[PDB]
Design a protein around this ligand. Structure first.
Ligand SMILES: *[C@@H]1O[C@H](CO)[C@@H](O)[C@H](O)[C@H]1NC(C)=O
Ligand code: IUM
Ligand code: IUM
Ligand SMILES: [Cl-]
Length: 350
């Protein structure tokens, strides 16, 4: 196996097996505790760089394992992550990416149906997926399937295949290359988790914040709310317990067959149609994560620097408890009718 794609497949298989942990003396007593970060990484190094900047400036994370999950191999991306010398780092690699399979499924096989070919013409052509369009009559485009595959694959991989997380008793926080973390996020996370155990038994997940940030943190920087988890508000910096993970992975067949190419809309469907109880989320009133890039980077940093006096709250408080009602997705977005995507997505659990 000599050409470039096969070299990348060999590296991926070996590195996922070896799981080289950077910046820890494996002879010592270190083990991941309380919080692990998992970052979904595609191919936007300029955004990954901002995220790495925010982790470098974050307080108290010298011992927090950060796992980077890649579906694109590049020297630029690997070199950005190799420069991280300040916390434990693991890189893992999605083994079914378009980069590794360019001209066959889950990339683009020449025998695949064109996106808009009508069904009768598709059947007459005999193209591979002619009997399996999505709900709107459209046939698969590989690039819109990859994000959902990667997300489910790495969910299972970090909770079940990462050796250093064997018998891990903390939470795992899922974020992306184009997020930016507030410097007190770990401080706030630990108090949120304690408040969850004291006051929100029915909460299954934690969020580091929604997309709405107030200009002044006054009166709100120490407050957290209990809410129905809503994909459009709480998909950024989502922290899972082992219990939420176990319930999710038992919903593999539903997640992998539901006809929506968005991982987070599919999760919304699981909350009303597969999970034993719909998700309630504990979430701060002031976000500790932001969505990103120089201008947009300084815009994040200016907001944080105006509110220095409010960061690192000494105690967090839950706001008034209201009835919360489960939320279903208002429609299916399609893009996920191809039975090969269903089958591959389901195989990750094995
Ligand atoms: C490398 O070879 C494999 C099969 O031998 C093929 O699927 C792949 O597209 C090739 N890629 C390049 C860049 O040559
Ligand atoms: O953005 U450049 O390394
Ligand atoms: O890929 U971003 O949200
Ligand atoms: Cl985006």
């Amino acid at each position: 196996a000599d050409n470039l794609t096969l070299r990348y497949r060999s590296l991926v298989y070996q590195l996922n097996f070896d799981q080289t942990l950077r910046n820890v003396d494996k002879a010592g007593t270190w083990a991941p505790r309380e919080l692990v970060l998992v970052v979904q990484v595609h191919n936007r190094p300029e955004y990954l760089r901002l995220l790495l900047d925010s982790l470098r400036k974050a307080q108290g994370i010298d011992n927090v394992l950060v796992i980077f999950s890649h579906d694109f191999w590049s020297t630029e991306i690997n070199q950005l992550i190799a420069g991280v010398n300040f916390c434990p780092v693991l890189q893992v690699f999605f083994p079914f990416s378009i980069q590794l399979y360019p001209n066959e499924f889950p990339g683009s096989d020449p025998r695949d149906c064109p996106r808009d070919l009508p069904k009768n013409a598709a059947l007459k052509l005999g193209c591979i997926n002619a009997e399996y369009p999505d709900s709107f009559g459209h046939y698969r485009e590989a690039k819109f399937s990859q994000t959902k595959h990667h997300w489910w694959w790495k969910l299972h991989f970090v909770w079940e295949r990462v050796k250093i997380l064997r018998d891990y008793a903390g939470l795992i926080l899922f974020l992306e290359e184009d997020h930016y973390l507030a410097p007190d996020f770990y401080h706030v996370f630990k108090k949120m988790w304690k408040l969850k155990q004291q006051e929100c038994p029915e909460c299954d997940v934690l969020s580091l914040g929604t997309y709405s940030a107030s200009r002044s943190f006054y009166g709100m920087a120490d407050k957290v709310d209990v809410k129905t988890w809503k994909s459009t508000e709480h998909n950024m910096g989502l922290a899972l317990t082992r219990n939420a993970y176990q319930k999710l992975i038992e919903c593999t067949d539903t997640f992998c067959t539901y006809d929506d190419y968005n991982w987070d809309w599919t999760l919304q469907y699981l909350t009303v149609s597969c999970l034993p109880k719909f998700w309630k989320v504990l979430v701060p009133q002031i976000p500790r994560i932001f969505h990103a890039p120089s201008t947009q980077s300084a815009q994040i940093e200016s907001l944080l620097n105006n509110n220095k006096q409010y960061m690192f709250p000494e105690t967090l408080t839950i706001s008034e408890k209201f009835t919360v009602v489960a939320i279903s997705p208002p429609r299916k977005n399609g893009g996920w009718g191809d039975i090969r995507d269903h089958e591959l997505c389901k195989s990750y659990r094995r």
